């Protein structure tokens, strides 16, 4: 926002040399130095030098590959097939399971939603509904908005799990899919997949499991020695699709994710086919046409580099860190932890002061946390980066000091960003907030 | 042969890279210049630069502008540069997207929501028959009706037919600069007349042509029609940096004449427990590496670079066009002024020519409705100097075929012809599903 350099607003009359381009780029990259010292929530999952170098070289070897042309790039076609099958194995899908590589968790979610809309249409459902917990990702609303589907969000329990009784009452003759999250992003709580799947089986409704965030942790937890309370994978009868982000705890480059299905019969509905196009018979498996095959190469590289032993070890370290932080953060007067988080995310509240004061303060001390709402809350997401750099001690100390400071003045009005997130929740005119967002989006592209 | 599960033990870097060389052992085909379109430069030094640029921004993600303010600036700049190239002026604006499909999808979604705002229940896209398949995806995904209007003998949209296709439900008009099948530019001024008269948004699909058409005049090859924001009624443009921008795959632009239109493409969830959610495009997390590399390509070529590149492509196109017009047995559809040349034949089955060119080691694009094949000339093709060889092989292929013009088409060539003549569209749809299934096979 406050840039210290003029904007390039047109193409240069004379193209720059390679060295000059890369030297000018240094000015932009030096601006982006907030994550390297382990002070950002989520965002960068490993960021390690030797890993980066491998992933960029792998990308580089496949820079011009485009899986739209599998006759030209059969090697890339085999890499993507292998990525999918590795994932189906990790989720114990067996030989009938299938999937596709996508650009991210959002596309993974949208693809399943679209698949289930088209199946519902085929069964005479005029306006399909998504039935989802309040905590399910925003991408489910985007799918509703994009694909013309009604979305019903059901309330959560005191422990921030979906209320299954309420979910039952939300089901109707028009329900196209059920959703649960492993875990939900806000508070890092795993929904009770078996209980939701019971409904899915009883009412004959597809069930999508959102494992975008947890996928490349939860798959390894048992082997890491941290067993979970609930099963989450294709072994659970009624689970019809899973989303999972390689680009989160797979340590794959950005622009990589999977949508997996229990059966090809489901995946078929996600496909787009135009048999009549002048430009040839056109069939795409996902949203994009042209895609960056380099990213798929690098994603395959991450997986083959970590292996089972690497992801188990990475999981062990993230979970050790999170369990330590969670037990400490439970013994601080003035805050509480929402629910009982078993993975990498911890959400905090305060019954004693405005919790956004803590996000404001920690921002000041060089930390970047996520700011939630409904109810008022903040979270941090623990990554390999955070375990590697051992920021856990300093995080705690800054949390403790901040809380003591706030506590000296518990009713002192809340300022800056914290104020906006507070007031936004109380504003009865939702369009005010919407209009505030559109200004923020515009401001992203500003060159003034 | 197939890796079907995670290795128990991770491979070392070197071992990973050594294994990956197995997958990259077919690139000589494209590298030799034998592939239609597909790779637009491929040039070694350019690749090194773009991969380094990507590498500097590998972990950047524009969902987090506060963390990566450098990427943010980069993307604002790519959009402003592109707006200048299309002479949009200060009120024009745009977004970086993942490719041309997403650019088309975004504009369609923008126009749908604006039509919803005016009480229209099922918004209609009015498009030429030649418009890209992505417009049918848009319709399918977003619940819009697509009306495809016929072409003239020159393969341009029939503008009278297009007017007759307009209804109270029309949300957008489309034309292409050029359309992908025949490489013909639609008469943008004439379509913009309708847009203005009936107050309908108009989207210009410049995904393919974008980073040629903007330089044509300066290359010394003035086009017949104007195409950019200076044309009254053009409300948006899609343009692929990953084609004639020579940018990495994963890179395209959607540009608007005014901010008011772009506001309709955005997604906002103010109520999400995870926080106020506002995304400009389809994706959430995105690869900022690709944007960095897209900026690098723009800054590396500059105006002089792209003018010179455009010169080299069009010289090659105009030569091949004049030569393919002087070959007994074949004709070229319409009058292509850019990088795509489409061939047909009234003397034999055109797919035989694709058969023989495939055997000679060339990969051309097979079209349909009507039976046709095309080549897309890229900067790679010009650097490799393949045009003469290309011509020689076409001539020999035609000469041969013309000895038995009425012989039965075999191979894929037959599939392409049968496909169009089948009465049950379904059977064709199923072959496609089966093809797509096969992409993901590990058997």
Numbering used by the authors:
A (entry chain B): 106 to 553
B (entry chain A): 111 to 553
Published text:
Deacylation of Cer to sphingosine and subsequent phosphorylation by sphingosine kinase lead to the formation of sphingosine-1-phosphate (S1P), whose irreversible degradation by S1P lyase (SPL) terminates sphingolipid metabolism. SPL (EC 4.1.2.27) is a pyridoxal 5′-phosphate (PLP)-dependent enzyme bound to the endoplasmic reticulum membrane through an N-terminal sequence, with the catalytic domain facing the cytosol. The protein is a tight dimer and belongs to the Fold Type I family. The active site is formed by residues from both subunits and comprises an Y-shaped channel whose distal part is largely hydrophobic.
To confirm the soundness of our virtual screening campaign, we solved the crystal structures of unbound hSPL and AfuSPL at 1.8 Å and 3.5 Å resolution, respectively. The structure of ligand-free hSPL was superposable with the one solved in complex with a known active site inhibitor with a RMSD of 0.36 Å (between 443 Cα pairs), suggesting that hSPL does not undergo extensive conformational changes upon ligand binding. Access to the active site is guaranteed by a deep cleft flanked by the last two C-terminal helices. The surface of this cleft is highly hydrophobic to accommodate the aliphatic tail of S1P. Therefore, the rigidity of the hSPL structure may account for the need to prevent a hydrophobic collapse that would close the substrate binding site. PLP is bound through a Schiff base linkage with a lysine residue that in the human enzyme complexed with a known inhibitor is Lys359 (internal aldimine). In the visible region, hSPL shows an absorbance maximum centered at 426 nm and a shoulder at about 340 nm, attributable to the ketoenamine and enolimine tautomers of the internal aldimine, respectively. In agreement with SPL being a well conserved protein from bacteria to humans, we found that hSPL and AfuSPL show very similar biochemical properties, although we could notice differences related to (i) an higher propensity of the fungal enzyme to bind the hydrophobic probe ANS, which may also correlate with the higher aggregation tendency and reduced purification yields, and (ii) some changes in the spectral and kinetic features, probably due to subtle differences in the region surrounding the active site. In this regard, the crystal structures of the two proteins in the ligand-free form confirm that the coenzyme binding regions are superimposable, thus further supporting the possibility to develop a dual-species inhibitor. Indeed, when C17 was docked in the catalytic pocket of both hSPL and AfuSPL, the best predicted poses were in the entrance of the narrow and hydrophobic channel. In both enzymes, one of the aromatic thienyl rings of C17 stabilizes the binding by π-stacking with Phe545(A) and Phe565(A) of hSPL and AfuSPL, respectively.
